[PDB]
């Protein structure tokens, strides 16, 4: 119709348009079970599909092309049908998000401008991150963002579980964990957890939209909800106050216990990626069990203590045939090392600018820029409680001055880029999009469009005309200028 968001990489018209209403005959070179679903959710559904065997007779066909680059698609709209290639099955559900924002919805059914589009992503590592660690979000909420992760072609989200203040993924060998830990919190929507159920439905409802979930089980730290659960994995059998005390590197029972959990983790999340976190070493200085540890591993100090731990969990992941993420802190300084499935996730641009990106690139580390400036969306544009100035920004900032943003080829160890939102502050749902959007409209682009020239202007223009188009689809927008936002813009 009128544009797709993210841009796609070539689009070049055609005279006419293809108007699709009724039954629907469609054709698939290979079983279209996997991305069909979709395809029945978003465009038609299926008691509107007649599935030929014969390819001429069909208004759609569903084609393979092995010469496309992976997640690539090609869509041809004549007059007469469509044809939507892709070497693999990501490919078309993008091919499905882009037919999506093409449609003109001028009448009932659908109306397609004829068109050929050939696109394709222009980084590997396209993620969004959601902290249901400090809240609870409905299962319904976590599908909302899913599917707006897909809806922006992005292939990972990133699922925040655990935290100081909920543990909220289900453990079968360690029933506290969710049944104490998920209840510590005591603000609006701090309480509640996911069943091994709920995640397996999550997870099918991702898949149907090409999107992988990436759990992040947090340790050695953010433990005080699995402390409460389990006070025996502190240094000592004892209690542990939550804020609206850390896991014991020394005790072997404690390393046994999250081997355990990620035993766990590993079984109901398929994810080639489990986040580890590893981002206040105040228990560990006065532990015997950690200062013994030190003596025996022939380790510095707190901070190689906690570099041997997080070695000890990613060599673990590693049998198990997953990647380990981290976070960047873990490698600010030198130390033990970490094994080769390790990956770093570059975070504190305000702080230590590039320091991460520069340790990860000198031990050989692949990278995901997720720098606090510009892609924590919880930022806001004007101050907010514990946001001052200094962790504000804009449309403007995330699109022109985007530390993550690298187009220049470079080392492939730099996989891509992620946004986040984390929930501090008590962020409830009713509080996420208007941070979200339109911000996140720069980070999806910047993820996916070849870096061809695109100026503010033209991006800004782009936002605004597909605004309503997003809005129906359940996305409320926030301001996206600091002009937007006034003097008093309401944030709760
Ligand atoms: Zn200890």
């Not at 393979?64 to 004549?78: A, F, H, Q, S």
């Not at 925040?160 to 969710?178: N, V």
């Not at 540890?293 to 049998?319: N, V």
């Not at 050989?364 to 544009?381: A, H, Q």
């Amino acid at each position: 119709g009128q544009i797709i968001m993210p841009t796609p990489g070539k689009i070049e018209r055609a005279d006419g348009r293809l108007r699709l209403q009724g039954k629907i005959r469609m054709y698939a070179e290979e079983s279209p079970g996997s991305f069909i679903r979709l395809f029945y959710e978003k465009l038609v559904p299926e008691s509107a599909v007649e599935w030929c065997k014969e390819e001429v007779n069909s208004h759609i066909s569903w084609k393979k092309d092995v010469t496309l680059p992976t997640e690539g698609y090609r869509i041809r709209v004549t007059p007469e049908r469509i044809i939507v290639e892709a070497a693999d099955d990501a490919g078309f559900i993008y091919a499905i998000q882009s037919l999506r924002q093409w449609n003109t919805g001028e009448e009932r059914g659908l109306i397609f401008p004829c068109v050929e589009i050939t696109d394709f992503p222009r980084v590997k590592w396209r993620s969004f991150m959601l902290d249901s660690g400090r809240q609870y979000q409905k299962v319904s909420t976590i599908k909302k963002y899913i599917d707006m992760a897909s809806m922006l072609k992005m292939n990972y989200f990133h699922w925040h579980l655990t935290e100081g203040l909920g543990w909220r993924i289900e453990i079968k060998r360690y029933p506290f964990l969710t049944r104490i830990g998920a209840f510590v919190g005591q603000g609006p929507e701090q309480q509640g957890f996911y069943s091994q159920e709920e995640v397996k439905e999550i997870i099918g409802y991702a898949a149907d939209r090409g999107i992988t979930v990436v759990p992040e089980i947090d340790m050695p730290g953010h433990a005080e909800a699995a402390l409460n659960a389990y006070p025996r994995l502190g240094c000592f059998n004892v209690a542990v106050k939550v804020p609206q005390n850390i896991f014991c590197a020394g005790k072997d029972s404690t390393l046994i216990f999250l081997k355990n959990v990620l035993d766990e983790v590993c079984r109901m999340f398929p994810s080639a990626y489990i986040h580890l976190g590893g981002d206040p070493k105040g228990n560990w200085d006065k532990c015997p069990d950690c200062r013994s540890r030190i003596e025996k591993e022939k380790l510095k100090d707190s901070h190689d203590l906690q570099l041997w731990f997080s070695a000890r969990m990613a060599d673990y992941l590693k049998q198990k045939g997953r990647k380990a993420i981290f976070w960047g802190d873990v490698i600010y300084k030198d130390g033990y090392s970490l094994p080769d499935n390790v990956v770093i996730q570059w975070w504190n641009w305000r702080g230590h600018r590039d320091l991460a990106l520069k340790n990860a690139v000198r031990h050989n580390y692949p990278v995901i820029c997720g720098t606090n400036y510009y892609t924590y969306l919880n930022f806001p544009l004007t101050p907010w409680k514990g946001y001052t100035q200094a962790r504000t920004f804009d449309l403007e900032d995330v699109y022109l001055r985007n530390p993550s943003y690298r187009p220049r080829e470079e080392n492939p160890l730099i996989l891509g880029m992620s946004s986040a939102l984390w929930t501090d502050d008590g962020v409830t749902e009713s509080m996420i999009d208007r941070r979200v959007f339109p911000r996140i409209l720069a980070l999806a682009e910047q993820m996916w469009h070849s870096g061809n020239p695109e100026n503010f202007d033209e991006f800004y223009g782009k936002v605004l005309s597909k605004q309503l188009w997003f809005e129906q689809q359940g996305y409320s927008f926030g301001p996206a200028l600091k002009e937007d936002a006034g003097t008093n813009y309401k944030w709760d």
